[PDB]
Amino acid sequence: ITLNSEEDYPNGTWLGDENNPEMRVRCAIIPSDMLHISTNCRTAEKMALTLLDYLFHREVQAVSNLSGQGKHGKKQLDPLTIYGIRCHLFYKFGITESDWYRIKQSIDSKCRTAWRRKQR
Amino acid sequence: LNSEEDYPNGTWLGDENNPEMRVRCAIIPSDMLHISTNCRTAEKMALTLLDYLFHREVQAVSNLSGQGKHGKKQLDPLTIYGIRCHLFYKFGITESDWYRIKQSIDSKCRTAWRRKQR
Amino acid sequence: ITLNSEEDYPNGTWLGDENNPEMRVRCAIIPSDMLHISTNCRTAEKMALTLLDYLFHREVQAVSNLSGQGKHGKKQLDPLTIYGIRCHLFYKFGITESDWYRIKQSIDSKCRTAWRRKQR
Amino acid sequence: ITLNSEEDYPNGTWLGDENNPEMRVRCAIIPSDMLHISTNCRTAEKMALTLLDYLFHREVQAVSNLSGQGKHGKKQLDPLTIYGIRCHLFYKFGITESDWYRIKQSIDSKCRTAWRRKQRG
DNA sequence: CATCTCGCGAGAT
DNA sequence: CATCTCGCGAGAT
């Protein structure tokens, strides 16, 4: 996978630290949405699920998960943006490998519920 | 975050001597001094700052998040950031306080929604 | 903005209640002019616009509005004076927040009349 | 009741400050159970919901809330017991009245889900 | 499932 | 009225 550049969402925001091209991804979140996100998410857990709601439509979340495998045709949550969220969580919160694993189980859990309600 | 030129003759929410905790706003200085004089608590200043910053028609269709059963719009996050910056810089409120103040703001918009349905 | 003191208009008058310094502005209106105003304006609406004609020249009213923003180079009507006008209407009439809103539209509407005719 | 006596549950346990007769309530939690609570509940928020389950059966929780006032004809969780929970969480975590307030919505929300299962089974 | 926390209408100050 | 704060159902974690 390849990183991107500002020209990919000129009206967007950087996930990660803008200073480190090795660990930064541009995304479509406009700055005011990010102001709100960075204001109301006091843990890496809650900002990871919130960034997700802001980057993956729940139509997509219902048919997707991290690995793109599993029953019922699970597609794969776009990897450039998943790299973005990890870049951001480590930038803002300094998460560990232990942490990222839990955040990955909750990302998948959230997509599981999005699928759960296209069922009902 | 905005610059002063966004409202040449407006006012600053928050600390003017902190470019990260200040939001230029359209409140005229006349009115701001009145807000600083006759709003002696964070809770009242929040609800009256709200009315100087958002028409009651925006308030009716809006809540703090944009989520909700009602297809609601979201109160401009730059302005809400300034409300918050200002309440910190004058009353020095905690985030617990800020949390409970924030429920009052949803509550106000929610009664605005009620009136708009009458 | 900063309140003034009596020494700013010794032959002037006080807008507001003279007893708390935090809600009184000294203005240049002579007391005789003030006697005519209080006897002749039986509403805050009417007194605000009459007060305005006594503190802002029509020259100035035509160029200005309350925001100092808008089209055609609006200048901001002096805030200390505006603070005084509202200090006065709450002293004499007890106006509410809703009331102050319409009166601000009146003041601005009246500034529009002064500008429309400056170039008729 | 009024701040009960230890004879009310001779072989039970104390909620709160044992050497403070106004901030202690005697309850029927057996001592092995209380030890388990003291060991495995590491926060006031979990201790409250866990204590709830040891002092009120599910069927009581279903038709109860903290105040007794509700759109439904609810009953009130025995205020003496709720006092003890409160005394306890403060005795062993030094919780704020702000905390107690938020913890008390958690209690009310738990009984609310107990209501939900009773009508789903 | 247990628990947290939300948006909500409407009763209380 | 304007504002506080409640009980609630249910989504989020």
Q: If you write DSSP's letter for every residue of C33-87 in order, what string do you get? A: HHHHHHHH--SHHHHHHHHHHHHS-HHHHHHEESSS-SSS--EEPPHHHHHHHHH
- Distance between CA atoms of A2 and B42, rounded to whole angstroms? 48
What are the φ/ψ torsions at residue B62 (nearest 5 degrees)?
Answer: -120, 150
Q: Does residue B2 lie within 7 Å of nucleic acid chain F, judged by its CB?
A: no
Alpha helices in chain D (DSSP H): 31-40, 44-55, 58-62, 79-93, 97-118
Domains and CATH numbers, chain A: 6-119 (1.10.10.2590)
Q: Which of A36, A46, A50, A53 to mutate to test the interface with B (most CBs of B within 10 A)?
A: A36
> B29-38 and B42-53 are packed helices; what angle lies between their axes, rounded to 10 degrees?
160
Under 8 Å CB-to-CB from D66, ≥6 apart: which residues?
D76, D77, D82, D104, D107, D108
State the distance between the two ends of chain A, measured CA to CA, in whole angstroms: 36
The neighbour count for residue D89, using CB atoms within 10 Å, is: 22
Cα of C82 to nearest chain B Cα, Å: 6
For residues C115 and C63, the answer to whether their CB atoms sit within 8 Å is yes
- Touch between chain A and chain B: 3 or more Cβ pairs under 8 Å: yes
Under 8 Å CB-to-CB from D116, ≥6 apart: which residues?
none
Of C22, C67, C97, the CB nearest to B28: C67
B52 three-class SS: helix
The neighbour count for residue A89, using CB atoms within 10 Å, is: 22
Read off the tokens for A101.
Answer: 């694993």
What kind of experiment solved this structure?
X-ray
Q: Does residue D106 lie within 7 Å of nucleic acid chain F, judged by its CB?
A: no
Strand E: list positions under 7 Å from protein Cβ: 2-11
For residues A87 and A100, the answer to whether their CB atoms sit within 8 Å is no
Task: Tell me whether residues C69 and B26 touch, CB distance under 8 A.
Answer: yes
- Longest CA–CA span in chain D (Å) reads 45
For residues C61 and C74, the answer to whether their CB atoms sit within 8 Å is no
Q: How far is CA B29 from CA A75, B37, B89, B117, D88, in A?
A: 55, 12, 17, 34, 52
In angstroms, the CA of C97 and the C1' of E4 are apart by 39
- Distance between CA atoms of B38 and C22, rounded to whole angstroms? 10
Under 8 Å CB-to-CB from D104, ≥6 apart: which residues?
D66
- Distance between CA atoms of A82 and C70, rounded to whole angstroms? 45
Q: Does residue D113 lie within 7 Å of nucleic acid chain F, judged by its CB?
A: yes
Q: Kindly provide the resolution of this structure in angstroms, with one decimal.
A: 2.6
For residues C77 and C66, the answer to whether their CB atoms sit within 8 Å is yes
Q: Which amino acid is at B51?
A: D
Of B9, B33, B48, the CB nearest to C83: B33
Of B7, B30, B51, the CB nearest to C79: B30
Residues in C closer than 8 angstroms to B33, CB to CB, are 1, 79, 83
- Longest CA–CA span in chain C (Å) reads 45
Strand F: list positions under 7 Å from protein Cβ: 2-10, 12-13
For residues C88 and C51, the answer to whether their CB atoms sit within 8 Å is yes
